Amino acid sequence: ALTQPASVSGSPGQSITISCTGTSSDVGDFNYVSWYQQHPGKAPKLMIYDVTKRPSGVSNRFSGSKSGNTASLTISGLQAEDEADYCCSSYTTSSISFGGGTKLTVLGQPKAAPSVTLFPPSSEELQANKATLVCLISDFYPGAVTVAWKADSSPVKAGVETTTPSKQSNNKYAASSYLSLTPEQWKSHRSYSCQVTHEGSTVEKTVAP
Amino acid sequence: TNLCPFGEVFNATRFASVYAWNRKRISNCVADYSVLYNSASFSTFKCYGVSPTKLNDLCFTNVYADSFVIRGDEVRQIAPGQTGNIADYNYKLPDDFTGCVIAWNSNNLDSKVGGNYNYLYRLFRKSNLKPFERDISTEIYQAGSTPNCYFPLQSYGFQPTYGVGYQPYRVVVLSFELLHAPATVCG
Amino acid sequence: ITLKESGPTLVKPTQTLTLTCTFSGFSLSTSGVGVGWIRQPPGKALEWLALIYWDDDKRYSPSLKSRLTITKDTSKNQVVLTMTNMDPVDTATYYCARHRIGYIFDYWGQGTLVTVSSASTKGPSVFPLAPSSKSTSGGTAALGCLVKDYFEVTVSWNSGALTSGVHTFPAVLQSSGLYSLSSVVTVPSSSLGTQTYICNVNHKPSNTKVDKKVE
Secondary structure, X not given: OEEOOOEEEEOOOOOEEEEEEEOHHHXXXXXXXXXXXXXXXXXXXXXXXXXXXXXXXXXXXXXXXXXXXXEEEEEOOOOHHHOEXXXXXXXXXXXXXXXXXXXXXXXXXOOOOOEEEEEOOOHHXXXXXXXXXXXXXXXXXXXXXXXXXXXXXXXXXXXXXXXXXXXOOOOOEEEEEEEEEOHHHHHOOOOEEEEEEEOOEEEEEEEOO | OOEOOHHXXXXXXXXXXXXXXXXXXXXXXXXOHHHHHOOOOOOEEEEEOOOHHHHOOOEEOEEEEEEEEEEHHHHHHOOOOOOOHHHHHOOOXXXXXXXXXXXXXXXXXXXXXXXXXXXXXXXXXXOOOOOOOOOOOOOOEXXXXXXXXXXXXXXXXXXXXXXXXXXXXXXXXXXXXOOOOOOOEEO | OEEEEOOOEEEOOOOOEEEEEEEEOOXXXXXXXXXXXXXXXXXXXXXXXXXXXXXXXXXXXXOOHHHEEEEEEOOOOEEEEEEOOOOHHHOEEEEEEEEOOXXXXXXXXXXXXXXXXXXXXXXXXXXXXXOOHHHEEOOEEEEEEEEEEXXXXXXXXXXXXXXXXXXXXXXXXXXXXXXXXXXXXXXEHHHEOOEOEEEEEEOOOOOOEEEEEEO
């Protein structure tokens, strides 16, 4: 019922617009359009209601308008802080309609190398005849990494499970990679390592019994 | 000394259906009519037989305030001399009307998703209403002779998607009566 | 000012979901106000479900109407949603929010994750992630705790006293079908052994809290 572009991109300081089209047979005069901002894993926040109005405490950089059956959210003076998905909402004769988000990506963001902390199996987990290595990756801006595990110097591919990347509050990305193994496999081998490759450069951390 | 409580009329939490229109009697108070006339929140403010500026200079024995909801198309029927579903069968102004007809768009309050059905109008009656008559009966109307029989009320079904002609309007009709009796409503 | 859904819930297929919204700051008796329910399936669009108005008018998704019910209790300031014949396609976050026509929805709840699966509920195994010389980066030391093999947890630190430097990572879905996650906090290296650090791990589907000391 409501159709939005999947993605829009703008560079800092400039203005961007996200359009929201309603089928003519569904929305009638298309009187009430609301716009929501939602940050990853967080609730929608109302930015524009009634096509053009701002709730108090929303910055004047956000504005909404309409023409025919297409409403527009406009953002001026783009800041990195307002990367998010923007979702429009309206009425049909029977329901409330939303249509899919628009992910807004602010461009020009500085590239950033991953920060890697690697944790050995706890002694308490080792008591319970299990062992897990925990490789936490964080604060990389181009949102893809590759993660490689290795025992001593031999590549390990078994018992490795790696999350997909996820976007953080500071618009950098995070991931985590777990290597599971038996306590006796951990006592065997001098060292285990986690290798994070980002943008052709590798940050590697090793842990030892 | 008491100020006339127009807020209980214009700002009431429920308005009536037009076939069951509400009447508020306004008595023993001072009314500033300009405060209302210059708010700019009224899409209709048409006074018949008097000017709203001169009205703060005048005294009346009683003021009646009749309020209801109709669709925007029908606001024109709240006037002396009109015919139509609302004028003939719901709320009728005398041809000699001295008062004011105030209306405003209430779509953001009186529509709802899937339609608001609470507001009804009378579609059929045996005869036209007399001025300021009210009919709240729910008898089956006979257009024929079998005991062609219709339920006499129809819902407005206000939809947030409607164009303005079909959106709900709150109406307030102020009647100023001047009788050979003590005046109690003055500006 | 506030709305809050009831806790995250596991629901067996074909059985019925029941959620409760508790709100504060406004009355569901005041004219024009309603409270509705909206869901978002992972990586999918917001989908309106149901609405209840100040005068007890009820409205529902036309396609889902036969499965939905909504109730209000103005004395308890709560609104209750029920949904029937639950299926794994209905796994989603479920939100309540305040309605007034002019703005559609303004204040939203934080949302509650509903999971439809025949798999059973498994609470977490919480293990400490001790700070060490190999987790030291100048003045900052990393410590955490590992929340292992559950079925989807929140983590605070020192009962909410410790918030800066906390990074709870999103969970991994193991080939076993169970989840694991980690939370790590960066504290001052000198602080260690001067300050006691506990992580507070709340599941909720299994009604399990664990406060794990990390030494």
